[PDB]
Amino acid sequence: IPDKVFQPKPEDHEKYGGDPQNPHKLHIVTRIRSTKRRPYWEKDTIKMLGLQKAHSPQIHKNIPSVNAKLKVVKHLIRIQPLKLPQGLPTEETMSSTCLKSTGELVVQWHLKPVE
Amino acid sequence: HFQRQKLMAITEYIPPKPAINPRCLPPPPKPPKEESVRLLRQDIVAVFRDNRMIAVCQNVALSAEDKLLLRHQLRKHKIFIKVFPSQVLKPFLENSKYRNLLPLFVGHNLLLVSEEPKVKEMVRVLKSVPFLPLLGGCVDDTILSRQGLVDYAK
Amino acid sequence: AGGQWRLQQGLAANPSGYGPLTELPDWSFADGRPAPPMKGQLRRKAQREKLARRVVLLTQEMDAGIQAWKLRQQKLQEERKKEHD
Amino acid sequence: RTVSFQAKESMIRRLEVEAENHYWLSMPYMTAEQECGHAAERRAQAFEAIKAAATSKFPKHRYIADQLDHLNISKKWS
RNA sequence: AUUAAACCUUGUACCUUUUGCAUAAUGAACUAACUAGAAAACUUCUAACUAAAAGAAUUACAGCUAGAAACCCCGAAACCAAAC
RNA sequence: UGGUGAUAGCUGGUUACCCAAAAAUGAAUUUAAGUUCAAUUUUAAACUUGCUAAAAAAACAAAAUCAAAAAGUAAGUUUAGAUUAUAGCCAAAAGAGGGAGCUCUUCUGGAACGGAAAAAACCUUUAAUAGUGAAUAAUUAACAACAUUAACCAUUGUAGGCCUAAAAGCAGCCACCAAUAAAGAAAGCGUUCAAGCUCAACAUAAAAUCAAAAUUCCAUAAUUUA
RNA sequence: CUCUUAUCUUUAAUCAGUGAAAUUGACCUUUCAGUGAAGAGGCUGAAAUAUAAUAAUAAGACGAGAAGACCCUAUGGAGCUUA
Ligand code: FES
Numbered sequence: 001i002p003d004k005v006f007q008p009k010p011e012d013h014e015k016y017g018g019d020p021q022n023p024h025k026l027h028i029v030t031r032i033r034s035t036k037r038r039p040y041w042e043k044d045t046i047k048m049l050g051l052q053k054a055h056s057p058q059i060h061k062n063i064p065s066v067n068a069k070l071k072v073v074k075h076l077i078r079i080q081p082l083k084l085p086q087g088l089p090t091e092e093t094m095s096s097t098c099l100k101s102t103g104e105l106v107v108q109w110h111l112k113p114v115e
Numbered sequence: 116h117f118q119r120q121k122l123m124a125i126t127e128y129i130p131p132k133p134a135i136n137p138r139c140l141p142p143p144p145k146p147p148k149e150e151s152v153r154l155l156r157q158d159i160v161a162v163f164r165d166n167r168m169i170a171v172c173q174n175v176a177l178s179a180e181d182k183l184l185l186r187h188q189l190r191k192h193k194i195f196i197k198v199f200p201s202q203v204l205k206p207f208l209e210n211s212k213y214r215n216l217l218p219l220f221v222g223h224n225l226l227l228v229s230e231e232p233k234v235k236e237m238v239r240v241l242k243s244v245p246f247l248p249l250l251g252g253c254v255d256d257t258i259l260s261r262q263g264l265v266d267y268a269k
Numbered sequence: 270a271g272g273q274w275r276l277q278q279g280l281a282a283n284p285s286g287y288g289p290l291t292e293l294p295d296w297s298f299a300d301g302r303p304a305p306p307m308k309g310q311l312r313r314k315a316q317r318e319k320l321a322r323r324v325v326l327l328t329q330e331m332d333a334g335i336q337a338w339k340l341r342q343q344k345l346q347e348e349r350k351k352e353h354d
Numbered sequence: 355r356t357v358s359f360q361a362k363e364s365m366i367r368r369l370e371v372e373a374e375n376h377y378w379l380s381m382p383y384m385t386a387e388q389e390c391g392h393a394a395e396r397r398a399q400a401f402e403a404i405k406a407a408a409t410s411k412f413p414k415h416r417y418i419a420d421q422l423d424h425l426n427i428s429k430k431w432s
Numbered sequence: 433a434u435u436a437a438a439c440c441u442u443g444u445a446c447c448u449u450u451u452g453c454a455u456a457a458u459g460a461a462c463u464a465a466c467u468a469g470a471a472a473a474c475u476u477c478u479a480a481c482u483a484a485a486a487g488a489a490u491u492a493c494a495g496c497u498a499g500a501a502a503c504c505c506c507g508a509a510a511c512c513a514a515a516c
Numbered sequence: 517u518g519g520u521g522a523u524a525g526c527u528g529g530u531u532a533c534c535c536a537a538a539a540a541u542g543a544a545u546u547u548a549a550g551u552u553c554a555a556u557u558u559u560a561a562a563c564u565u566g567c568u569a570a571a572a573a574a575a576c577a578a579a580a581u582c583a584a585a586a587a588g589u590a591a592g593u594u595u596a597g598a599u600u601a602u603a604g605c606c607a608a609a610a611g612a613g614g615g616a617g618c619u620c621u622u623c624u625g626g627a628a629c630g631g632a633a634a635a636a637a638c639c640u641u642u643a644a645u646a647g648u649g650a651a652u653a654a655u656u657a658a659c660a661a662c663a664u665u666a667a668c669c670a671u672u673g674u675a676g677g678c679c680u681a682a683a684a685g686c687a688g689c690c691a692c693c694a695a696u697a698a699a700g701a702a703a704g705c706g707u708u709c710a711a712g713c714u715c716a717a718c719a720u721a722a723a724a725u726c727a728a729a730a731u732u733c734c735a736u737a738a739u740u741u742a
Numbered sequence: 743c744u745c746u747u748a749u750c751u752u753u754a755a756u757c758a759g760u761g762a763a764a765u766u767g768a769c770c771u772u773u774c775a776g777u778g779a780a781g782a783g784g785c786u787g788a789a790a791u792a793u794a795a796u797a798a799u800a801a802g803a804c805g806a807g808a809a810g811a812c813c814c815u816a817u818g819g820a821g822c823u824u825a
Contacts, residue, residue, distance in 0.1 A: 008381045008640040016377045023381035025331055026324070033653085034641050037625055044568060048588055052642065054432040059323050061331060063392075068569080071379055075368075080415040088328055089321045095314060097321035101281050105324065111289070114279065116608095117632080117639075117655095121357050121365050136725085157695090178671035179696055179718090186696085199697050201719055221699095223719050272651055283651040334384060334392035341387075355632090356658035363652090372555055386571085390586055397587085405564065440771105444785050445632100445768070448528095451605055452627070453636060455782060459528090461766050468530050476559105505530065506521105511601095513519075634777070634786045732774060734788070 006071075024081030027060045028103060033076045045073050057099065155203040160199045160211050163256075166228035170237055170252035170264070173224040175244065192236035194229040212256075219258055224250065234268050 013020060031051040035043045049069060050058060059082070060066050070077065080103045089097045089107040099105045135141070150156075150191065177185075186196045201223040208214045229237060241249060251264035259267055272282030281287050292313075297304045384392075 006376055008377055008380045012377055016374055018292050018377060018381060020381065023383045024378070025383050026327065027378065030643095036641070039624065041568085045588090048568065050589090054642075057320065059320060060588095061327055062378075062381070063389050063587075064382050064384070064386055065389060065569080067327070067379050067382050069588065070375075070518085074375045074379070075372055077375065078371060079350060079378040081378055082324075088325055094321050094325075098287060098315055099317070099320070100279070100287065101276060102279055107321075111293070113289070117355060117357070117361070118365070120355065121362055124357055124362060125365070158697095172691090174719095176669080179698055180672035182698095183672070183696055201697090204719095242633095270651075275651095281651090285650055301406075316356040330392065331384070334388050337392070345402075355656065358655085358657060361655080386586095387583065401565070401590080404550085409593075410562070444782105447767105451603105451636090451737085453605095455778065455785075459767100461768105506527100508522105508524075511519105511522085513517105515517080732789105734775075 018081065023062065024083075025062055026082040027062055027066065027070065028080040028082055029058050029060060029070065029077040030055050031076055032078060035076070042073065042076075045069060046076065049073065051077065116257040150206075150209075152203050152206075155199050156207070156210055157195070158199055159204065159207050162195075162228050163207070164212060166230045167256055168229055168232075168237075168252045168254045168268075170212075170227035170229070170249070171219075171224050171239065172227070172241075172244075173222065174246050175247040176223075189227070189240065192239065193231060193233060194227060194236060194240070196225070197228050198226045214252070216256075216258070219250070219253065227252070237268060 008018075008020070016022065029049070029051065031046065031054045033054075035046050046052070049060075050056075051073075060070075070079065081103045083102075085104050086107045089105070093107045096109050097105060097107055100111045182196050182198075189196055201220075203222055205217065205225075207220070208217045227237070227240060237252065249261050249264075251259045251261040252268060253259055254264065254267040257267075275282050275284075285291055292310060294304050294307060294310075
């Protein structure tokens with residue numbers, strides 16, 4: 001596959017809402033398919049990545065080695081950029097953290113409807 | 116496989132829909148007209164200018180060679196059967212001395228072109244066959260009927 | 270059904286995900302004494318807290334790598350500017 | 355076998371999702387140089403624990419209490 | 433399951449054998465009894481004693497003594513001896 | 517009758533439960549229903565990197581082999597003892613015999629309780645627990661063709677030269693001009709030969725890139741409320 | 743035989759007495775088409791269908807069967823005889 005596939009365009013950035021500068025640090029990956037009937041190399045990568053259970057949240061760094069590994073298993077995973085509206089959680093708030101489906105990890109859970 | 120068949124359908128190109136079909140389009144500009152036919156203009160222009168009165172009689176399926184003989188027969192009468200295809204006859208009025216004789220030159224009919232006021236010679240031609248519809252002669256390039264021709268052929 | 274709409278509103282596609290219905294206690298004493306925390310809720314809290322610690326560690330490690338990267342480029346810079354005699 | 359309309363849409367969705375994966379994999383936050391050695395310390399520590407655990411096998415001890423406790427089987431009412 | 437025995441719904445007898453398959457093929461009227469894994473030379477393990485061990489014959493520069501731990505059933509065509 | 521429970525690599529049968537690991541390469545064999553050797557697996561011991569990945573450089577010709585550092589990750593090497601397994605099936609790729617299809621060699625995958633009609637081999641599916649909960653995956657159905665060609669007429673030279681009896685546009689054979697408004701020295705017809713049927717001639721019409729075999733039919737139906 | 747018919751006996755059917763054999767996984771034991779290995783009472787899809795009985799016929803399922811029949815082979819065995 002040509003490298004142009006992984007070279008983004010200005011329109012692509014708008015569609016996916018990703019800024020070319022300050023790229024997202026952490027990837028959110030969940031397995032949505034089975035590795036049965038797949039070649040051994042595909043099976044090995046999934047086990048190494050820890051995505052044994054489907055729909056299992058995993059925190060991984062957006063680094064070339066992880067990026068290379070994720071590309072191999074791209075079709076079996078969903079990639080979402082992590083967002084920290086309130087910043088990194090503190091030690092005291094480590095028990096109050098909650099990750100939303102939108103990709104935002106709130107450090108304080110107030111048990112109030114967003115509405 | 117079923118999945119492979121799905122790919123084939125996906126390759127089908129998606130064409131956009133035009134706003135209006137060509138037949139139902141608003142009247143668009145069309146290519147300019149061109150006079151191809153141009154040669155025939157000179158031939159009719161010269162003969163009509165030369166001959167003031169043009170007796171007219173719808174040809175009764177006459178053969179081409181007969182016209183050659185009739186041309187010589189009129190040469191005895193000092194007249195000529197100079198006729199040309201009628202598709203280029205209609206644009207004659209468009210580019211000629213007159214522009215208003217189009218209704219008179221409706222249909223394809225024999226044109227008897229005479230420049231001299233030899234009435235007896237012209238009528239003798241009429242005496243050959245009267246049954247074909249003889250519209251009349253435009254004496255002095257003026258609209259005349261068959262009876263009008265007689266009233267003004269004098 | 271309705272998972273797509275729930276995602277559109279920002280809620281979990283499956284109502285059994287993150288929500289007051291699942292997270293909140295399901296009962297309390299008639300006397301008013303609060304009920305003990307649910308074992309599943311406590312179990313779920315532990316995993317969420319553990320994942321948060323991993324996020325902090327990964328970010329801290331990435332921060333160190335970013336700084337240590339620049340630090341390695343500062344050693345090259347000072348190495349270039351050298352003289353003797 | 356003519357393709358059902360539902361199947362075509364499902365395949366399109368998978369391709370579209372994979373396209374998003376491509377974009378988010380198109381912006382590596384850390385360059386190649388930064389990655390080198392960033393996790394070296396952690397990996398070294400982890401292997402040391404692995405070696406210690408792996409080489410900890412040995413036969414288990416035997417205690418007098420086990421033999422002596424068997425005599426309690428004869429306990430009865432006074 | 434059910435208010436309800438039957439209706440509605442679900443479900444291609446068993447062993448053996450074939451390919452990890454039988455809509456193949458073998459065997460079975462049923463009841464009761466009877467009907468097929470057996471050996472310690474060495475090793476591991478459990479202990480006694482220790483440059484010694486073993487109640488004679490053995491082994492030994494940690495060995496030696498004791499204990500425990502193991503390997504089916506039925507069925508030929510035949511072959512030979514001695515009588516009838 | 518006894519030897520005799522003869523022998524039988526052959527046929528058949530061979531009686532409780534639970535947990536863990538777990539079959540299908542190379543070499544030789546009267547060998548391919550078995551056995552030995554390598555390789556695996558396995559137990560014990562010694563102590564440390566291993567697997568995936570891996571830039572550039574070569575090697576070849578002008579994504580694997582090799583393997584810096586990483587990274588993702590937890591096994592690996594050596595020593596000692598020891599066997600069992602060593603026969604698939606089908607699908608799908610790459611070749612070679614070949615020309616259908618087959619016959620092989622090599623790589624890849626599989627063993628639903630879901631789906632494709634029933635469906636070992638295809639698709640969705642990480643194990644298995646109770647509950648009259650919930651979100652989803654695959655999922656036998658699908659929605660005739662045309663963008664030069666439609667009306668009218670057909671005269672004269674020369675029946676032009678050619679073996680043709682004769683062949684005149686029209687048996688052969690020719691080159692290939694004129695008049696005319698328009699006539700092809702002829703386009704298909706007709707042809708004892710020609711007369712003769714039209715097509716092109718001129719006048720006058722009107723147009724403008726492929727689709728959706730023999731028992732007995734076999735769900736029933738169904739074009740528009742977002 | 744054309745061209746079959748009639749009568750009598752045996753069998754047959756009824757009453758009463760006595761009373762086997764091969765066989766047998768269980769069967770609440772249907773038809774059409776499909777599927778499959780030539781192949782379906784038991785699968786797939788249609789159809790038919792009060793319960794229980796009673797009396798008749800042997801064409802086909804290229805019916806089911808045996809170590810039946812014939813010919814030939816073996817750088818197969820084994821046995822026997824030798825000049
Ligand atoms: S709608 Fe038919 S030509 Fe315009």
